[PDB]
Amino acid sequence: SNAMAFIQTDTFTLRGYECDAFGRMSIPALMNLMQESANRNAIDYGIGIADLAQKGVGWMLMRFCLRIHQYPRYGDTIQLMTYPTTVDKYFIHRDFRVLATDGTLLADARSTWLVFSMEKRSMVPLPDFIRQLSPPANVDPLPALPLKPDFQTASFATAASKSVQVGWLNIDQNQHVNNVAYVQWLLEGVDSEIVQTREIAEIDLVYRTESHWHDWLSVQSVTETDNSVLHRISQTESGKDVLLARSRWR
Amino acid sequence: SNAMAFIQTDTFTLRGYECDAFGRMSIPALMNLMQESANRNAIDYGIGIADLAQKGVGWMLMRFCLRIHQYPRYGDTIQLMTYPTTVDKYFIHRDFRVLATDGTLLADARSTWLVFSMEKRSMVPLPDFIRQLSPPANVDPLPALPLKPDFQTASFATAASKSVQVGWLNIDQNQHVNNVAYVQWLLEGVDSEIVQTREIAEIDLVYRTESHWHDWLSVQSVTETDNSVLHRISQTESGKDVLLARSRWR
Ligand SMILES: [Cl-]
Ligand SMILES: [Cl-]
Numbered sequence: 001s002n003a004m005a006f007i008q009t010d011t012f013t014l015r016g017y018e019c020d021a022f023g024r025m026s027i028p029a030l031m032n033l034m035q036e037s038a039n040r041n042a043i044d045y046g047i048g049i050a051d052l053a054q055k056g057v058g059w060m061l062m063r064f065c066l067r068i069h070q071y072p073r074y075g076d077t078i079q080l081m082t083y084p085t086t087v088d089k090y091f092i093h094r095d096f097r098v099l100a101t102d103g104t105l106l107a108d109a110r111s112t113w114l115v116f117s118m119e120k121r122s123m124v125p126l127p128d129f130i131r132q133l134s135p136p137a138n139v140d141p142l143p144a145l146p147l148k149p150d151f152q153t154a155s156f157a158t159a160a161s162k163s164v165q166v167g168w169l170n171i172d173q174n175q176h177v178n179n180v181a182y183v184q185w186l187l188e189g190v191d192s193e194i195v196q197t198r199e200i201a202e203i204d205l206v207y208r209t210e211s212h213w214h215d216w217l218s219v220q221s222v223t224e225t226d227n228s229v230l231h232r233i234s235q236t237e238s239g240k241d242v243l244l245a246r247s248r249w250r
Numbered sequence: 251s252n253a254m255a256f257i258q259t260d261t262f263t264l265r266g267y268e269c270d271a272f273g274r275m276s277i278p279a280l281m282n283l284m285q286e287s288a289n290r291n292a293i294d295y296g297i298g299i300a301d302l303a304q305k306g307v308g309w310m311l312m313r314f315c316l317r318i319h320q321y322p323r324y325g326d327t328i329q330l331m332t333y334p335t336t337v338d339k340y341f342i343h344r345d346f347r348v349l350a351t352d353g354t355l356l357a358d359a360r361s362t363w364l365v366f367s368m369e370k371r372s373m374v375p376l377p378d379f380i381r382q383l384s385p386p387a388n389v390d391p392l393p394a395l396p397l398k399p400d401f402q403t404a405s406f407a408t409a410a411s412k413s414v415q416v417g418w419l420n421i422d423q424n425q426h427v428n429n430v431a432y433v434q435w436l437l438e439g440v441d442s443e444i445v446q447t448r449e450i451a452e453i454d455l456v457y458r459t460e461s462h463w464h465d466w467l468s469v470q471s472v473t474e475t476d477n478s479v480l481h482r483i484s485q486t487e488s489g490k491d492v493l494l495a496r497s498r499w500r
Pocket of ligand 1: 149150151
């Protein structure tokens with residue numbers, strides 16, 4: 001009755017508002033589309049958000065690393081593909097590839113997801129009905145994504161904090177803060193000089209604590225190298241980390 | 251070589267992130283799509299943003315009133331149509347209609363646009379090549395949109411101000427603040443109680459001053475009636491108005 005494995009593949013024509021002040025596809029727009037394609041793929045596998053919710057569990061995004069080889073532009077048509085590559089005790093690993101009409105690999109992403117128990121309020125082994133899934137054959141998996149990158153430990157002790165509040169518009173239809181909201185805050189926090197003169201080549205994301213509607217957060221960053229920046233978003237009150245990241249610029 | 255008139259018509263399948271915390275299509279997403287369809291229509295007419303820029307003039311959105319008869323939801327397919335209805339000395343009037351697969355009119359919008367001279371830095375009579383355009387025959391124009399609504403004059407003297415800053419993400423690929431950014435700020439400013447218990451039936455927008463990257467703005471609102479709110483966004487420094495609006499809720 002259902003196929004054994006699924007490669008989600010979607011064609012999107014870029015809208016004007018999906019492009020930044022330079023005419024390049026914005027990273028939040030891309031990531032939002034990636035999350036949509038990943039959701040459609042999960043549904044085909046019977047591991048969609050609703051499938052999990054109805055068994056009392058939910059997905060959490062832990063790691064996400066997006067590499068932009070070449071930015072598409074207004075009215076370009078792009079092909080977004082996504083699928084699981086491997087499934088282990090606690091994690092599913094999901095790849096994304098974005099192709100130009102050209103065939104050029106415009107962008108790729110790797111991601112790591114865990115399952116949270118709604119009873120236990122904590123990570124649990126992936127239930128059997130998720131362990132059992134077959135990733136698709138005949139795709140070439142992107143390189144491994146380190147679970148705990150070294151920048152996780154970096155100090156932001158002297159980095160100035162900028163305050164932001166979780167708004168209504170940042171809440172998705174699953175009643176959670178959209179993980180893209182954090183990337184938007186992080187991007188707004190980047191030095192004007194860098195924004196005006198460089199583009200992101202890669203953004204590597206480590207998600208820690210969940211935030212809620214109305215939470216106050218602090219956004220920080222530190223120059224790491226001539227073309228890389230580290231970023232931290234944390235709860236202003238508790239001081240708990242919500243997002244840690246590295247951006248590489250070119 | 252080109253047709254005499256154009257009805258822009260596009261079919262969009264709603265993505266998850268285009269829906270709010272209640273699963274209803276968000277107004278910013280709809281308005282962004284409307285602006286995209288209006289841009290594609292203008293290009294067919296030879297009055298697109300670039301067409302004007304290359305003659306040293308530009309469009310400004312003055313009035314926009316969106317009525318949502320029924321909110322579409324995730325994965326619904328909607329049909330967005332737009333066209334000019336009339337052209338007069340200074341203004342073009344543009345209608346939008348949004349249809350469900352059903353045929354239901356989900357939403358409509360009316361809008362009024364003027365032409366700004368880049369030499370004069372002020373509104374000018376529409377150039378001949380815009381005056382001459384033929385709106386499409388065989389469409390039923392929505393009711394007239396008052397140029398200067400009475401709420402324009404309302405006092406916000408005692409309404410508390412909330413401070414917001416124009417960010418990089420609010421700048422469009424035409425290097426202007428996206429007019430949707432103001433609606434997002436206005437929406438974030440609405441009483442939590444209202445957001446949690448009502449939906450917008452109509453939002454009526456009057457655009458005044460242009461803002462720029464990094465401008466500080468103040469967001470205010472006042473209860474007008476049991477199901478209506480007035481909103482004001484202004485430049486915190488100069489105190490000049492940027493947006494005045496009425497929302498009706500149901
Ligand atoms: Cl590292
Ligand atoms: Cl009025």
